[PDB]
Enzyme design. Structure first.
Site, PDB file in Angstrom:
ATOM      1  N   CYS A 210      -2.193  -1.006   1.420  1.00 21.11           N
ATOM      2  CA  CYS A 210      -2.763  -2.160   0.748  1.00 21.11           C
ATOM      3  C   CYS A 210      -3.634  -1.671  -0.398  1.00 21.11           C
ATOM      4  CB  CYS A 210      -3.591  -3.020   1.707  1.00 21.11           C
ATOM      5  SG  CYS A 210      -2.673  -3.628   3.135  1.00 21.11           S
TER       6      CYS A 210
ATOM      7  N   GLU B 284       3.761  -0.113  -0.115  1.00 15.84           N
ATOM      8  CA  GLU B 284       4.331  -0.858   0.994  1.00 15.84           C
ATOM      9  C   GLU B 284       4.516  -2.320   0.608  1.00 15.84           C
ATOM     10  OE1 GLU B 284       1.969  -0.723   4.482  1.00 15.84           O
ATOM     11  OE2 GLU B 284       3.152  -2.212   5.581  1.00 15.84           O
TER      12      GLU B 284
END
Ligand SMILES: O=C(NNS(=O)(=O)c1ccccc1F)c1cc(F)cc(-c2ccccn2)c1
Ligand SMILES: [Mg+2]
Ligand SMILES: [Zn+2]
Length: 274
Positions: free
Chosen positions: A141, A175
């Site tokens: 993140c 991701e």
């Protein structure tokens, strides 16, 4: 069942974008107060003001792996600083939709971007990273606090994350799912990096060449070149197809005229000299 909807951190008041699971009593308050240095979250201005006078932290914990002028990055192991990283993940969830992980911070290493003055090192944002990513994600993140968004700090962290991938002799990709702002930021970053290399290397590079030079995955390179319409397809193979007019007319947009904060690999302390 009021959520946290406003925070005061440093000299900033910021509205929340998403639910973050602070303990229920903390959400009941009108605002929640964050120490900008240790990220302790508090319920009252008076508890916050008292903490400011007592807290001796003036920077993130962990190793300062980057420092050039007043721009600094701290590498924080989730296992070594569990509370700090949990607070960071709760803060980040206020501005991230998909992030589901807040308290089991041990599998992650956190890279805190700060901006320094005479008072201390002021948190700008961060990206998390799995110590062992089975997919090959060099970013889990990534979050820039709203007052700092769209000002080059996110671009610095993305570039920083690929610098780490280079020093690990690997490619990597953020991701998925990306945030709305992360998707624009990565697409913009990938475009500039690929367009600059093709301008300065006469295009005598394959997709595999670009991947080794930038640690960007061949897939992210191909989808970016597809967006730039700079790839041919031949018998199952992607082939870069580019001319100066193509490179320049894509490079000379307004997007690539803001002067970046720049990852000077000289100031990145990856390995000790002995
Ligand atoms: O602040 C950012 N973007 N603007 S930028 O730094 O000036 C820039 C210019 C050109 C190219 C790239 C680039 F990042 C930024 C980047 C990200 F990856 C994530 C978030 C984010 C997302 C969700 C919540 C908070 N924050 C913000
Ligand atoms: Mg706001
Ligand atoms: Zn503190």
């Amino acid at each position: 069942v009021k959520y946290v909807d406003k925070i005061h951190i440093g000299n900033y008041e910021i509205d929340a974008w998403y639910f973050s699971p602070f303990p229920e009593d903390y959400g009941k308050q009108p605002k929640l107060w964050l120490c900008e240095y240790c990220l302790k979250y508090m319920k009252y201005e008076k508890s916050y003001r008292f903490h400011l006078g007592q807290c001796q932290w003036r920077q993130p914990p962990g190793k300062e792996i980057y420092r050039k002028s007043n721009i600094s990055v701290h590498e924080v192991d989730g296992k070594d600083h569990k509370i700090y990283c949990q607070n960071l993940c709760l803060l980040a969830k206020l501005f991230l939709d998909h992030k589901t992980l807040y308290f089991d911070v041990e599998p992650f290493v956190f890279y805190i971007l700060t901006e320094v003055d005479r008072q201390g090192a002021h948190i700008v944002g961060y990206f998390s990273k799995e110590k062992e990513s089975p997919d090959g994600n060099n970013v889990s993140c990534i979050m820039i606090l709203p007052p700092y968004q769209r000002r080059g700090y996110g671009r610095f962290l993305i570039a920083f994350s690929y610098e780490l991938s280079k020093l690990e002799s690997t490619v990597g990709s953020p991701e998925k799912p990306l945030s709305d702002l992360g998707k624009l930021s990565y697409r913009s970053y990938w475009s500039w990096v690929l367009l600059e290399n093709l301008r300065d290397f006469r295009g005598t590079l394959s997709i595999k060449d670009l991947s080794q030079m930038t640690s960007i995955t061949q897939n992210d390179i191909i989808s970016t070149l597809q967006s730039l319409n700079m790839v041919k397809y031949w018998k199952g193979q992607h082939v870069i197809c580019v001319t100066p007019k193509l490179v320049e007319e894509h490079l000379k947009s307004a997007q690539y005229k803001k002067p970046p904060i720049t990852v000077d690999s000289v100031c990145l302390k990856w390995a000790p000299p002995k």
